[PDB]
Amino acid sequence: LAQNLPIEASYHRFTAELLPLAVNFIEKLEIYIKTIQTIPKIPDCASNMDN
Amino acid sequence: QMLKEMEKEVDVVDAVVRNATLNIPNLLISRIESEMHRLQMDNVYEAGKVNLITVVQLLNEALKLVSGERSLYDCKGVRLDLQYLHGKAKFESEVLTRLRNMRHKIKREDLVSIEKIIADREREWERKWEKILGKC
Amino acid sequence: IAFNQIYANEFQMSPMGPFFQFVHQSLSTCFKELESIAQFTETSENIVDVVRERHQSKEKWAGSTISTLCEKMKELRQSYEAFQQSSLQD
Amino acid sequence: RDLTLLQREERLRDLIEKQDEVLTPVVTSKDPFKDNYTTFATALDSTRHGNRHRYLEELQKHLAITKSLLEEIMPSHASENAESFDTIKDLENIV
Numbered sequence: 001l002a003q004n005l006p007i008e009a010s011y012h013r014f015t016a017e018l019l020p021l022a023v024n025f026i027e028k029l030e031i032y033i034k035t036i037q038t039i040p041k042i043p044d045c046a047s048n049m050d051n
Numbered sequence: 052q053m054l055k056e057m058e059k060e061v062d063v064v065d066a067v068v069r070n071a072t073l074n075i076p077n078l079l080i081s082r083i084e085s086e087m088h089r090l091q092m093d094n095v096y097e098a099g100k101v102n103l104i105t106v107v108q109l110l111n112e113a114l115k116l117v118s119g120e121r122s123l124y125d126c127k128g129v130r131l132d133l134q135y136l137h138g139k140a141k142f143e144s145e146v147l148t149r150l151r152n153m154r155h156k157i158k159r160e161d162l163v164s165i166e167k168i169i170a171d172r173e174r175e176w177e178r179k180w181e182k183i184l185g186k187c
Numbered sequence: 188i189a190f191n192q193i194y195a196n197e198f199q200m201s202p203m204g205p206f207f208q209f210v211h212q213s214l215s216t217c218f219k220e221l222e223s224i225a226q227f228t229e230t231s232e233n234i235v236d237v238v239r240e241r242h243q244s245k246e247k248w249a250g251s252t253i254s255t256l257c258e259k260m261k262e263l264r265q266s267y268e269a270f271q272q273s274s275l276q277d
Numbered sequence: 278r279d280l281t282l283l284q285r286e287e288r289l290r291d292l293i294e295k296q297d298e299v300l301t302p303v304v305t306s307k308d309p310f311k312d313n314y315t316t317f318a319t320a321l322d323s324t325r326h327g328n329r330h331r332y333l334e335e336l337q338k339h340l341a342i343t344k345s346l347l348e349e350i351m352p353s354h355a356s357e358n359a360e361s362f363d364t365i366k367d368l369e370n371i372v
Contacts, residue, residue: 001198001320005329011204014211019071019103021214022110028218029076029113035225036120039129042224045231046135053307060318067321104332107339114346121350128352130326131227131361140368147371188306194313198320201333206340213347219359220352226362230369237372 071101079113086112325357 007015025032073095075083083090090112095105181187241256248259352358 001324003324005333006201007207007333008200008204011207014204014207018207018211019101019106021211021218022106023071023073025214025218026079026106026109026113027074027076029116030078031225032117032221033078033120035221036117036124038228039125039224042129042131042227045228049231049234050139053311057311057314060315063318063322063325067325104336104339107336107343111339111342111346114343114350118346118350121352125352128354129224129358130354131223131358132326133357133361133364134326136227136361136364136368140364140371143368143371191306191310191313194317198317199313201330203333203337203340206337206344210340210343210347213344213351216355216359217347217351219362220355223358223360223362223365226365230365233369234372 071106073101073106073109075109078116079109082112082116083109326354 005015075095083092090108092108093102093105095102095109177187243255245253245255247253248256254262
């Protein structure tokens, strides 16, 4: 509603998983860009489907 | 009466309540090469190990590209009306069920009754004429 | 009472740990959002094709004549309209 | 006749008294609840649509940029959009 490495143990997870996540994003960058280009067609796509 | 009037709200509320090889895309390479003078980036792999700082730097560049593209094609932010999609899936499912019920009604009720009547009539007829003719 | 109370009151070491969490959660959400937009576009196009194929496809439904599903259905409808008209004039 | 009717009325009174005792507190707190809950539900519904130390310091500098870029790129409904993926796939299969 309102809206070893010395790291604190509560945050180990976030730190360990950040690498793969970043790699994955970088590798799929082109796909994400194409997807963003299709965003203006989304209303037409919705109308054709309804018909 | 109070409990009945609050049903819709309850529903809304319930809905809420319920090995690192890096292939860098050409687009990012092209960006890094064009801005190479500005982007002091170390090698992704140093002494055979992954440099996490470089990866994060690459990620930042990638995100800038994404930011640029979103500013061009998604100025207002695209909203996929989740309620619309749920309403459409539910309706089409009902159509499918109606077609199946119709076919089941035709196959298990209507054709079974009709086929029985046809068989009785064909037998009654064959018996009647077999008696009158003494042969098939 | 408990709800009303909560509604009135609430609803009405390296310092690096919080940065990792934030970047991780934000990046993950970004992934999923873009995938969803892509899927919507694909599905909308597939549905348009399936329906088009069904309306244009010619098959031997009954007898010796090839026809679309819509044509054969129309023929069948006309035939039973004709049968019903012949029965009301009785 | 009189004895039989009196016995039945006594039973009815006992039952009504037991119910009044428990219903009175609930009816008095109703209107504030209903109003607070409805306002709450409507509000909720509107949201759905070298040295190692030196190393961590350098990393923080770049993650801070990352954090700033992600805050800029992410639309306000990004989380809602991300939840729609399964529903879209279900629609296609049904058709």
